[PDB]
Design an enzyme around this catalytic site. Structure first.
Site, PDB file in Angstrom:
ATOM      1  N   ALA A 145     -30.440   7.693  14.374  1.00 44.30           N
ATOM      2  CA  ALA A 145     -29.430   7.965  15.379  1.00 44.30           C
ATOM      3  C   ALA A 145     -28.409   8.992  14.902  1.00 44.30           C
ATOM      4  O   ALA A 145     -28.189   9.176  13.696  1.00 44.30           O
ATOM      5  CB  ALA A 145     -28.717   6.662  15.794  1.00 44.30           C
TER       6      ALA A 145
ATOM      7  N   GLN B 116     -21.798   5.291   4.584  1.00 43.34           N
ATOM      8  CA  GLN B 116     -21.270   6.599   4.960  1.00 43.34           C
ATOM      9  C   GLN B 116     -20.578   7.267   3.770  1.00 43.34           C
ATOM     10  O   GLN B 116     -19.828   6.619   3.033  1.00 43.34           O
ATOM     11  CB  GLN B 116     -20.245   6.463   6.109  1.00 43.34           C
ATOM     12  CG  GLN B 116     -20.743   5.722   7.386  1.00 43.34           C
ATOM     13  CD  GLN B 116     -19.976   4.430   7.741  1.00 43.34           C
ATOM     14  OE1 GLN B 116     -19.750   4.151   8.922  1.00 43.34           O
ATOM     15  NE2 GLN B 116     -19.596   3.643   6.739  1.00 43.34           N
TER      16      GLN B 116
ATOM     17  N   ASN C 287     -26.558   6.475   3.533  1.00 44.08           N
ATOM     18  CA  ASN C 287     -26.692   7.930   3.533  1.00 44.08           C
ATOM     19  C   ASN C 287     -26.254   8.519   2.196  1.00 44.08           C
ATOM     20  O   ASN C 287     -26.776   9.542   1.775  1.00 44.08           O
ATOM     21  CB  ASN C 287     -25.875   8.593   4.652  1.00 44.08           C
ATOM     22  CG  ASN C 287     -26.366   8.251   6.043  1.00 44.08           C
ATOM     23  OD1 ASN C 287     -27.543   7.955   6.260  1.00 44.08           O
ATOM     24  ND2 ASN C 287     -25.448   8.295   7.010  1.00 44.08           N
TER      25      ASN C 287
ATOM     26  N   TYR D  22     -28.851  -0.056   2.867  1.00 41.08           N
ATOM     27  CA  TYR D  22     -29.146   1.224   3.518  1.00 41.08           C
ATOM     28  C   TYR D  22     -27.911   2.116   3.484  1.00 41.08           C
ATOM     29  O   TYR D  22     -26.806   1.678   3.826  1.00 41.08           O
ATOM     30  CB  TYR D  22     -29.586   0.969   4.951  1.00 41.08           C
ATOM     31  CG  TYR D  22     -30.017   2.184   5.733  1.00 41.08           C
ATOM     32  CD1 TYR D  22     -29.108   2.887   6.515  1.00 41.08           C
ATOM     33  CD2 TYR D  22     -31.338   2.622   5.703  1.00 41.08           C
ATOM     34  CE1 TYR D  22     -29.492   4.003   7.234  1.00 41.08           C
ATOM     35  CE2 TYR D  22     -31.744   3.731   6.435  1.00 41.08           C
ATOM     36  CZ  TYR D  22     -30.816   4.409   7.202  1.00 41.08           C
ATOM     37  OH  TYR D  22     -31.204   5.489   7.939  1.00 41.08           O
TER      38      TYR D  22
ATOM     39  N   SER E 273     -31.294   9.691  11.405  1.00 41.02           N
ATOM     40  CA  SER E 273     -31.817   9.156  10.157  1.00 41.02           C
ATOM     41  C   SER E 273     -33.342   9.213  10.034  1.00 41.02           C
ATOM     42  O   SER E 273     -33.861   8.974   8.956  1.00 41.02           O
ATOM     43  CB  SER E 273     -31.336   7.726   9.939  1.00 41.02           C
ATOM     44  OG  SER E 273     -29.947   7.716   9.678  1.00 41.02           O
TER      45      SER E 273
ATOM     46  N   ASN F 142     -27.643   7.417  21.927  1.00 44.00           N
ATOM     47  CA  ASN F 142     -27.829   6.393  20.905  1.00 44.00           C
ATOM     48  C   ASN F 142     -27.812   5.010  21.560  1.00 44.00           C
ATOM     49  O   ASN F 142     -26.747   4.446  21.807  1.00 44.00           O
ATOM     50  CB  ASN F 142     -26.735   6.512  19.835  1.00 44.00           C
ATOM     51  CG  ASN F 142     -26.840   5.453  18.739  1.00 44.00           C
ATOM     52  OD1 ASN F 142     -27.804   4.697  18.661  1.00 44.00           O
ATOM     53  ND2 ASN F 142     -25.836   5.405  17.884  1.00 44.00           N
TER      54      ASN F 142
HETATM   55  O1  LIG Z   1     -20.494  10.214  13.804  1.00 50.34           O
HETATM   56  C1  LIG Z   1     -21.373   9.345  13.619  1.00 50.34           C
HETATM   57  O2  LIG Z   1     -21.313   8.216  14.158  1.00 50.34           O
HETATM   58  C2  LIG Z   1     -22.548   9.634  12.714  1.00 50.34           C
HETATM   59  C3  LIG Z   1     -22.102  10.044  11.312  1.00 50.34           C
HETATM   60  C4  LIG Z   1     -23.303   9.951  10.370  1.00 50.34           C
HETATM   61  C5  LIG Z   1     -24.622  10.271  11.072  1.00 50.34           C
HETATM   62  C6  LIG Z   1     -24.414  11.281  12.192  1.00 50.34           C
HETATM   63  C7  LIG Z   1     -23.523  10.682  13.279  1.00 50.34           C
HETATM   64  C8  LIG Z   1     -22.851  11.772  14.031  1.00 50.34           C
HETATM   65  N1  LIG Z   1     -21.971  12.723  13.600  1.00 50.34           N
HETATM   66  N2  LIG Z   1     -21.618  13.531  14.699  1.00 50.34           N
HETATM   67  C9  LIG Z   1     -22.332  12.981  15.700  1.00 50.34           C
HETATM   68  S1  LIG Z   1     -22.366  13.523  17.390  1.00 50.34           S
HETATM   69  N3  LIG Z   1     -23.075  11.943  15.343  1.00 50.34           N
HETATM   70  O1  LIG Z   2     -29.072   6.896  11.979  1.00 50.45           O
HETATM   71  C1  LIG Z   2     -28.632   5.719  11.956  1.00 50.45           C
HETATM   72  O2  LIG Z   2     -29.003   4.848  12.795  1.00 50.45           O
HETATM   73  C2  LIG Z   2     -27.643   5.370  10.861  1.00 50.45           C
HETATM   74  C3  LIG Z   2     -27.200   3.892  10.869  1.00 50.45           C
HETATM   75  C4  LIG Z   2     -25.713   3.650  11.114  1.00 50.45           C
HETATM   76  C5  LIG Z   2     -24.786   4.543  10.286  1.00 50.45           C
HETATM   77  C6  LIG Z   2     -25.395   5.882   9.881  1.00 50.45           C
HETATM   78  C7  LIG Z   2     -26.464   6.363  10.854  1.00 50.45           C
HETATM   79  C8  LIG Z   2     -25.871   6.669  12.193  1.00 50.45           C
HETATM   80  N1  LIG Z   2     -26.401   7.583  13.035  1.00 50.45           N
HETATM   81  N2  LIG Z   2     -25.630   7.664  14.199  1.00 50.45           N
HETATM   82  C9  LIG Z   2     -24.663   6.789  13.970  1.00 50.45           C
HETATM   83  S1  LIG Z   2     -23.402   6.528  15.183  1.00 50.45           S
HETATM   84  N3  LIG Z   2     -24.747   6.162  12.782  1.00 50.45           N
END
Ligand SMILES: O=C(O)[C@@H]1CCCC[C@@H]1c1n[nH]c(=S)[nH]1
Ligand SMILES: O=C(O)[C@@H]1CCCC[C@@H]1c1n[nH]c(=S)[nH]1
Length: 358
Positions: free
Chosen positions: A315, A117, A149, A147, A61, A340
């Site tokens: 993250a 999401q 996406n 917040y 993010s 993360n």
């Molecule tokens: O899967 C998640 O928790 C997230 C989805 C929205 C942000 C990106 C993250 C992600 N996708 N694939 C991988 S590895 N991390």
């Molecule tokens: O980047 C972040 O921290 C976001 C916050 C939580 C949900 C969407 C994103 C996310 N990124 N990786 C995962 S897991 N979730």
């Protein structure tokens, strides 16, 4: 690096890596406007590849800061206005809840409860249109921050429409190229895969999954060197020679809304410096950061305040990042990791380092 920077960095990061079991890490400190780099551990555990200054990490993010600046640039170009209705750029968005929802609302997560999401099932433009048409707001526009996406993601997609360019091409040409971020990618090219670190989640090597609006909300991968350069550009935008980009950086650090002691910009979030560390550290926890909160409009928005702590956590499934800078002090930090780990641990480490050097 000077021994002072070396000692605070190592005394802060070594325990962090140990406590959080982070496989690999890169840190840049910008001190009096100049970068100093540090690396630890593994970009790839299995292949024994160390983290280096050329290792690409998923920013997650933190990508939203680029999206905010690209948007700012489009405003500066006169291609879009934050006051424009969303429907100006997507006419097929005819459902009446979109009346009164502007590009400002989308950019700042205040459209009225757009979800964190984008659902996994939403892939195509068709799926996306259907998703937004059927979306029912919880609140009126400009009243609560949640917040999301699906909010800033849509902002990014719509902001580049008048240009005629894809979001990637817009970002490359208008932000990455001018700033000499030549190892920063929305899609990592085959030639660069040797430098692309693996993310680690429950000990499994993972990379980010494709998703709708991924590029706009969480799709940037970069090196510690490029990210130091990104911080330097946002610290000192007047040194940037491209007029619209200079202006766009300043618009992204304008204060549009306040909730508690934080201000929402375009991608960036800001607090007044000197900051209370409990506010940024505790505020970074997702129990607060992802919470629905009422916002007070800053009418009109405050131009970029130099005496600010400007930051963004980011993250993916396998990566954890943080960037923070204080323009008043020519001071900043980038922390990139291939796990993360909790946001407050990131912000705590960052504040200890920057407070020591301030
Ligand atoms: O899967 C998640 O928790 C997230 C989805 C929205 C942000 C990106 C993250 C992600 N996708 N694939 C991988 S590895 N991390
Ligand atoms: O980047 C972040 O921290 C976001 C916050 C939580 C949900 C969407 C994103 C996310 N990124 N990786 C995962 S897991 N979730």
């Amino acid at each position: 690096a000077p021994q002072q920077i070396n000692d605070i960095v190592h005394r802060t990061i070594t325990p962090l890596i140990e406590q959080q079991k982070i496989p690999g890490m890169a840190v840049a400190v910008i001190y009096q406007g100049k970068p100093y780099y540090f690396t630890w551990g593994y970009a790839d555990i299995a292949k024994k590849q160390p983290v280096t200054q050329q290792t690409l990490f998923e920013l997650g993010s933190v990508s939203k800061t680029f999206t905010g600046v690209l948007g700012g640039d489009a405003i500066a170009r006169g291609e879009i206005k934050l006051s424009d209705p969303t429907t100006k750029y997507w006419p097929e968005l005819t459902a009446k809840q979109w009346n009164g929802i502007t590009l400002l609302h989308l950019a700042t997560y205040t459209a009225g409860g757009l979800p964190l999401q984008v659902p996994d099932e939403v892939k195509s433009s068709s799926d996306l249109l259907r998703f937004y048409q059927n979306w029912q707001p919880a609140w009126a526009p400009g009243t609560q921050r949640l917040y999301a996406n699906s909010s800033i993601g849509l902002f990014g997609a719509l902001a580049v429409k008048p240009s005629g360019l894809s979001f990637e091409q817009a970002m490359q040409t208008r932000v990455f190229q001018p700033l000499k971020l030549n190892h920063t990618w929305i899609n990592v090219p085959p030639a660069e895969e040797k430098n692309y670190a693996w993310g680690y989640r429950e000990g499994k090597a993972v990379h980010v999954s494709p998703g709708a609006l991924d590029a706009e909300a969480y799709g940037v991968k970069s090196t510690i060197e490029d990210m130091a350069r990104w911080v330097q550009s946002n610290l000192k935008p007047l040194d940037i020679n491209e007029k619209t980009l200079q202006q766009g950086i300043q618009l992204a650090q304008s204060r549009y809304w306040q909730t508690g002691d934080m201000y929402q910009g375009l991608g960036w979030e800001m607090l007044d410096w000197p900051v209370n560390p409990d506010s940024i550290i505790n505020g970074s926890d997702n129990k607060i950061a992802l919470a629905a909160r009422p916002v007070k409009a800053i009418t009109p928005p405050t131009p970029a305040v130099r005496a600010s702590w400007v930051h963004k956590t980011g993250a993916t499934g396998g990566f954890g990042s943080y960037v923070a800078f204080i323009p008043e002090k020519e001071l900043g930090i980038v922390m990139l990791a291939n796990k993360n780990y909790p946001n407050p641990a990131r912000v705590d480490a960052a504040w200890q380092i920057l407070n020591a050097l301030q």
